[PDB]
Amino acid sequence: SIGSSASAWTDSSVSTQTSTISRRLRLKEMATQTEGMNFDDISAAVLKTKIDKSTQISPNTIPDIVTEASEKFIPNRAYRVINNDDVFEAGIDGKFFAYKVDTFEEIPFDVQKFADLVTDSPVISAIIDFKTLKNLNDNYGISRQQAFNLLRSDPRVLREFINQDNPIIRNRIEQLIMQCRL
Amino acid sequence: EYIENWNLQNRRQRTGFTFHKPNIFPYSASFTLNRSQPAHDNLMGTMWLNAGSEIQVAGFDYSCAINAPANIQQFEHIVPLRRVLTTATITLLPDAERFSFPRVINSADGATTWFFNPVILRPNNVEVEFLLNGQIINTYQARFGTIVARNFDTIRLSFQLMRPPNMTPAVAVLFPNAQPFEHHATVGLTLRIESAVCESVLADASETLLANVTSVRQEYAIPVGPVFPPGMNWTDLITNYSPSREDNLQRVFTVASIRSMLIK
Amino acid sequence: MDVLYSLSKTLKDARDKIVEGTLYSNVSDLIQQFNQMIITMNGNEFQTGGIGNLPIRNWNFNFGLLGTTLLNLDANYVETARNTIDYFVDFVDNVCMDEMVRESQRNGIAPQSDSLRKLSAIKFKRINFDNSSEYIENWNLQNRRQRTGFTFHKPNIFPYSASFTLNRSQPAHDNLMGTMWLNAGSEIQVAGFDYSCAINAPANIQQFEHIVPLRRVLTTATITLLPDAERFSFPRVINSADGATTWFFNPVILRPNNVEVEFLLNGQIINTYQARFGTIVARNFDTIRLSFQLMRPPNMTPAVAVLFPNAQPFEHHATVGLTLRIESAVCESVLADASETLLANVTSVRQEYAIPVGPVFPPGMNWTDLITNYSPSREDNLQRVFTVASIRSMLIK
Amino acid sequence: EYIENWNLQNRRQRTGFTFHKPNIFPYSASFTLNRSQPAHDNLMGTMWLNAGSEIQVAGFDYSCAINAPANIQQFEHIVPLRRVLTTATITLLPDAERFSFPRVINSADGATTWFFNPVILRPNNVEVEFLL
Amino acid sequence: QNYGINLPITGSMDIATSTLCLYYPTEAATEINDNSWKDTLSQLFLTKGWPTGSVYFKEYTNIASFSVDPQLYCDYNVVLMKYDATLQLDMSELADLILNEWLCNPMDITLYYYQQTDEANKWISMGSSCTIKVCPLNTQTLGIGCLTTDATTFEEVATAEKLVITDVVDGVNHKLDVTTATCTIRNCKKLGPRENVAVIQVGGSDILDITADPTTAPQTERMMRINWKKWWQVFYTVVDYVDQIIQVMSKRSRSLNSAAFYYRV
Amino acid sequence: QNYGINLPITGSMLTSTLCLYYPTEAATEINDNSWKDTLSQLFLTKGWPTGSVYFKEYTNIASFSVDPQLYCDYNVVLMKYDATLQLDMSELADLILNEWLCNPMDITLYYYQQTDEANKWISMGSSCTIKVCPLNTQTLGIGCLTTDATTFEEVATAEKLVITDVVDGVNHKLDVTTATCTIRNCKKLGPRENVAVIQVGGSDILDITADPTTAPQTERMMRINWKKWWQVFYTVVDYVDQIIQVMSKRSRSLNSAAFYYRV
Ligand SMILES: [Ca+2]
Ligand SMILES: [Ca+2]
Ligand SMILES: [Ca+2]
Ligand SMILES: [Ca+2]
Ligand SMILES: [Ca+2]
Ligand SMILES: [Ca+2]
Ligand SMILES: [Zn+2]
């Protein structure tokens, strides 16, 4: 029981625990308990695009490719939970952050509170992770609405920044895409 | 004392806090295997617990240094400190009680478990050194009881397992030269800082300042702030005892002393 | 010594009380004492050091008095006061270090440093203020030959001693009866072992006695007595009495039987505790006698029966134990304890300034040797150095 | 401190004494057997010593939870203090050195004696609750 | 992947597909007298959890024939040795050879005199008919109680043996008269235990001595014994407790990737 | 004064001789007249100076059991295992691995009882035949007639060495072939740590304790599997260090006898 209550969702020590919890959280997307975009939304889009492009895909090969894409695309996934002006973000690779929504200032991570929140509260895929968010805030004047939407994984704001040609967000999305390997 | 040290620090004069059993060591129970096999039948290494003011270390060798050079195995244990202690009185005893019993211990990677069945021998060529900036400030060889370290930031404990050159039949049967090692030679040391003086604030066994601050925060459900770890965990505080953490800790401890002057 | 303590106390009061913005009524009497000190010290010259690596320093005193005109102390007043107090505190520090690094085989209670000898003159007696600290209070009582007492938490009374005695033995060390003990600081751990488990002993009981005499009389001591000695409860390979060979010790712990702890003062039974464990009180004693028995269990289950045979091959050795911790005590003499830092301070000053070994204390102020031979001369010197160390720590952090 | 608490108690105000290692636990060295039989060769239970300011407890099982559900055996130890403590600094350590060596213990009724030969494992799911 | 160097491994005390070869004598198959018995045991092992095709059954006519360079290729090997009051030394030597890891170098008895360096070094000879006759030499390289030229004077320490483990006095040169025609003798050194293979003797009274030292005759976990009357019952017992047998055994240390440059197989 | 006994002892926390007893069949198989010299030279390499290792030959276990003699500081006895001689081997091992204090038993005139569990009757001779008759309180026989030997109970027949253990606290009328046997009332003082026995073959069947609940295996009781006596002797020579380390020379007695006689 990592958190206060013993749930099947929440079954360096902090790095290990958060990595395991995030690996389980990957199934929250399948369970449809998320907000905003999803890593598997990006993966499905990339899979469709590549399948349409490819000239060396046979009908007997499509099932294997689809299964591999579902199981492999974006191995490194990060999930965040927002709780009354506090954000807890955890990745499958053992990177965990805790910060304030307004100022993006790091706070000591609380594994127990993170587990309690992630048990039931919606989990937002960190399409724009904390490092990229802080870099973007430092080098650009993110508005309050822009920060809110980026934390909530707003497709509108994400496309807005891509069209504006923000190098930081474009690099982040490019890394996400390139991680869709087989 | 606390307001005295506050004013002295403001005046840039050297401060000083006297602690009984200072809580300077972050809790850390671990082992290191210098020689290992997947079966864990024949192990050599060290096994320690650092907590509060006590270090308990034990070197173990399953072969009892049968093939070691000069029938001697050397174990070392280096414990750094997050803050410099001065004029510390320490009790150094030649056996580690904690690691002198049969144990089943999970392996380094946690995949499996191994059996530790110690038989205690006297530590050999014990050398306890208190070093400041890598320079030996104090050193005591083969001396136990009460010792004094006037100024230091790390402790280096060196000891040896020597195969008894002469053994009675019971001991000879105990230590074979073959593989199956039913009894594993173990030596160890215990080192407790009874009292010390530090330029920075610390928790200790005779004060209640950490308890007061943690109690107030818990009672009023203060959200985790940007400085202290969750729940004012002393292990984390003393592990990453950063300068900002030290500043905030001294402020809160001084306030807690001021409050305890009036509240029971 | 009282003059030195008065200087330290008045400087400490000055640093604590002479702070910006305070009323002059809070510091009127303190400033009168301070001006008395300045007037008594002006025109005198002192010299501290010259032993080992302790530097030789010359101290001169020419200080104007502190004013007596402000309603509330201001920044100027505090600056003047602190500029004077820093010099005075440095002088006190060096006087205390010079006194601590010195010892004498004859008249060890008397001052040894030149500066403290100078301060022992009558002209400085006017700087006496009050003697409120425990150490200075006991210093004065000892000077008056009155009863003294220091309260110690975990007194460091027992010199380190980890040893064993064998009452039955063979060259093979396969059937042994005896005792093992560790006495350190304020802790006694004793174990009585019998390899035969009293199979043939009369009444199937083996008697064990451990007599620990103290080098000083303790009074009103709280003691924790526990029915086992964890330090002698695991397998051991112990080198024999002469170091010629090694013997094996594989203990099995049974409860100690007929436990009697006697606290005797000059051979008279002051306190006796029969089969009582936990917190006990020894009001006055100079020796501890722990008596315990190993009784062969009259009824054994098959496992215990297999453990304890009637033939020679004793694989498991029956063992009983007692632990005795002295939590607090009062001693008319000075000792080292787990709370104070006076032994630490004296040792640290001597080590820092590379003071050569003297004729009184053992090298490096080894507490084990000191308390093993706690001579009256050593006690006088130790009280002197500890009192001056407390005076010093009153000002130096 | 003591006169101040005396006056506060007379006024019926707050009282407080600060203790280093308070002697709050009456001496109690005992054991409880939840599974047992006359041979005392397959025992499950807990043995403890509460003394002064230290609780030292150890749960033992001879079968090592071979037949237990999920290969887990639970142990509990409740120590009720006779007075309410506050702002207490406590040290918790994961082994009971006092119950880690072989020993021979009298039975609950004292009829016979039984052998305890511990091998020490790491306690998992350690929970410490301070209740009021 | 730092191979070939020993780095200390640090762990914390707060933290919390294979194949099975089963060697049996021909007497077992003869008594069973069923052609499908191996398939039956494969299905039973499958129920126990061993996927079909992961259990191999090996047969040897006798301990004497099996001792001729026994090769055990499997993640886990279980040898059903059969006790014989006349073959205690043969069983002990076979068990030592298979249960322990030996690093062996060639011997040229026609070209070099030989001595054993330490207590862990023996001479292992295998073949159709190994007859080992030694002659110790003094400092002058002259035989002690044996004329060097004349081989009859030598001291016979084996005769028509399929397998022999000879332990001569250490530090003294020896001249050997092995029958190289039908025997190969190697200078072997015992490095440690082989966790891959375990022996389950059937019958007898625990008479295996796997240490040259006479003061010690250890009984490791990999050495087991069972009383028997029916080979069907023996095989059922092995199948039913294969979990315990595998737990007693362990994966061969020298075969793991970590063994690279440390005398890997 | 005694050797400082009764006074507590406090502490702080080559020249010897090696006798090697072997059966005749070992020499018969080796068939080399110089094998004793060869073994002495090998012991010299191991570290035993020439003239310090002596080899003793006994025909059989039964013949050796007739009043065995222990000569050197360290004695190493090789007994070949025989499935039908387990009790004889156990008795020989007991006699030579434990110290005994024996007294005469003139059974032709007195009744004898065993005081306690440590007391036994040791019979040694060319051929011994012990017949015992327990006696009740009135001195009459329990299941036997004192005046009729044939009613006595057989406890041993034509045995070179017998260790009889009758019920303690009850007198016995004994009948033995005194002409070819000597019976002694012996007491087991304790282990004799200067004698070790290396059984050759078998399966650890030595029981040196009359108690049935205990069959201990001391460090001085070893076992080896063998096919060549040359290999056995090479093993002994090469591991002489371990064998000696297992035994203590201090237990040697002034007389080369397996027991003390009214000492
Ligand atoms: Ca063979
Ligand atoms: Ca020859
Ligand atoms: Ca050899
Ligand atoms: Ca017989
Ligand atoms: Ca009859
Ligand atoms: Ca009897
Ligand atoms: Zn304390």
Residue numbers in the entry:
A (entry chain C): 583 to 593, 606 to 776
B (entry chain o): 134 to 397
C (entry chain n): 1 to 397
D (entry chain m): 134 to 265
E (entry chain O): 51 to 66, 78 to 326
F (entry chain N): 51 to 63, 77 to 326
What do the paper's sentences say?
Rotavirus, a non-turreted member of the Reoviridae, has a triple-layered capsid that is assembled stepwise in two separate compartments in the infected cell: the virus-induced viroplasm and the endoplasmic reticulum (ER). The icosahedral inner layer of the virus, composed of 120 copies of VP2, is in direct contact with the dsRNA genome and encloses 11 copies of the viral polymerase VP1 and a similar but undetermined number of copies of the capping enzyme VP3.2 The intermediate layer consists of 260 homotrimers of VP6 arranged in a T = 13 lattice on the surface of the inner layer. VP4 is a homotrimer of three chains (A–C) associated in an unusual asymmetric arrangement in the infection competent TLP form.
Further rounds of focused unaligned classification were performed to enrich for particles with the additional density adjacent to the trunk domain of VP4 resulting in a final class consisting of 30,964 sub-particles which represents 25% of all spike-containing sub-particles. Further 3D refinement followed by masking and sharpening yielded a map at 2.7 Å, which enabled an unambiguous rigid body fitting and refinement of the head domain into the density in the prone chain. Compared with the upright conformation, the prone head domain is rotated by 117° around y axis slightly offset from the trunk and displaced by 37 Å. Notably, the map enabled modeling of C-terminal residues 222–245 within the trypsin cleavage region of VP4-C head domain. The loop is stabilized by a beta hairpin from the VP4-C trunk domain (residues 414–420), which is folded back compared with its orientation in the two upright monomers (inset). In this alternate conformation, the two domains share an interaction surface of 844 Å2, stabilized via charge complementation as well as hydrophobic interactions centered around residues 298, 318, and 320 on the trunk domain and residues 227 and 234 on the head domain.
